[model samples]
Target: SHMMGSLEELAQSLEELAKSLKKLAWSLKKLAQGAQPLEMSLEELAQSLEELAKSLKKLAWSLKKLAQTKKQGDSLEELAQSLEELAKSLKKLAWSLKKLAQQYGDKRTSLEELAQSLEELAKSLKKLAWSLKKLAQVAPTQRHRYSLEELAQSLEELAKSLKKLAWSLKKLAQGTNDSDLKSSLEELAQSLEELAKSLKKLAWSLKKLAQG
Candidate 1:
């Protein structure tokens, strides 16, 4: 019984060790994911530090000015001049802020590489869309619409077929022995015969429609 208790205790200790190791692994994974956001926070803090430095310098300048102009009644004029300069400076700063916001808010980035990648992707998509549009235009259904020009072409085709049939019959009567030409002429005659039958059916339908 004592040996069995020791074995059970060893098994429990192994299980606990496994659970602890798993917890450690999970903590490491969370830390890995947090690293990027922590780096971004560092960047924001650096920017704030820079602004703080600027504010300190401005405070020092104002303190020096006040020391030089103690108990002055023309402080209003001085204030007016300072306020005017401040307004002008603020306006310029506002314009800069607007430009900066346009270039680097949530939608934009200061990263030159990312901007270049976005520009390239936009160009690639534009080109791909254009090529797809061109491909759509070249579809067989788009090219093969029947028109007045096709009707005129069909009439000329009928005339040519009849002329060829007549020429073949005459040549056959003349006992021509060019087997290839005779074979082609015979095929052409059959094809035209079938074509004429189809066209006649088409014309009869058109005539019915016209009567309606």
Candidate 2:
């Protein structure tokens, strides 16, 4: 009878831990959902960067063929316009990240710090994007030019941060030992999987943008 009581106590303890961890799992889901807008914006920014890089290549090719071509200036203006669009996207991402950080402020210290880091990085990205816009106004055929490779790297790093956050949540879900919470764990795992995939795709897009 004492052994049975001990078993019951152990089961109850496990249940409590499971319940706590289940809340964490859903917290992670909330974080992921909060980050979705930022992720989408980054993806769109990546596409824009990729398109601008192609435009740069075309401009280079055209300039090489005709040193004084009017098309060169038009291409520069078009690239500048693209950078403006990216700048606007960055503004929205900043607002979203700020809101997300505040929403999850009560989570683990690690999570809060991660969100802070993400916010700082997003700000840096925005600053860099604006700087690129200023530089984009310069003609590629001019004496100097800027590269979007650094911006792409920053985007990739942001994606890595998101992936790390997802994995941390995944580990939290997996650490729960209660059999009764298996369904909750499974759902958490599924959410983490989707978040991870989205982050990876965003990172890949940034990589391609850099290479372009």
Candidate 3:
């Protein structure tokens, strides 16, 4: 009877330890999640979570084995307690995965919308380019001098550059799965922003020349 009681005490202690460890793991996982970078891709985040989930699952499995160690009546109690902790951890991990998937879905939708917007911007740039070309060809006044026509040509070239930039961005959105392409896409986006500023300046120069 004394041996049986001693075993029971040990089992209870182990069950408590398992619960504490599971809770600690849970808190660590949450901390890891909260520390994730904002610009990190969903694929990278999913891979990270998958690795952590694997570790948690292995720990849970080990606990189950420990709980089933001795062939005694009291062993069932310990096993039940350990399994309960395992279930809780599994459920929490599953919830985290579900949330990640949902966030990824939302990101993909936003990316598609951005692609559509870029397509429209590209068309507008092409139209503006054509108008500038026509204006350069026929100006019946001093406003349509050699310098003014050159400026119009420059505007057309700038529009072409912008249209090309938009096309690049659209490709970037399409190739989000490719890291190299994505990196290039970001660079192109930054370049396009600067180019837009330059184009705006070009527009002002042409308008002034037209007034003259």
Best by TM-score: 2
TM per model? 0.22, 0.34, 0.33
Tens digits of per-residue lDDT, candidate 1, 105-192, equal 4423322333243244334334433332333334323433333234334434443544444454344424433324344334434443
- How far in Å is the alpha carbon of 26 misplaced in model 3? 40
Please report, in order, the local distance difference test score of every candidate based on alpha carbons. 0.36, 0.43, 0.45
lDDT order, best first, reads 3, 2, 1
* Model 3 C-alpha lDDT per residue in residues 1-212, reported as the tens digit of each score: 33233333343433333343344334334434544533334344334434434443444444344334524333333444443443444344444434444544546554444434434443443444344345434533634456555655665565565556556555645656532445444544554544444454545555555566
* Worst lDDT 10-window in candidate 1: 2-11
Q: What range of 10 consecutive residues in model 2 has the weakest lDDT sum? A: 2-11
Better TM-score candidate (2, 3) = 2
Candidate 3 segments exceeding 4 Å error: 1-104, 140-182
Candidate 3, residue 79: lDDT: 40
Tens digit per residue, CA lDDT, model 2, 1-212: 33233323333332333344345434334433443444443343334334333433443333233323345555445444543444444344444434444533344454445445545544654565465455456654452312544544554565565456556546655654533344554554454344334434443543454454
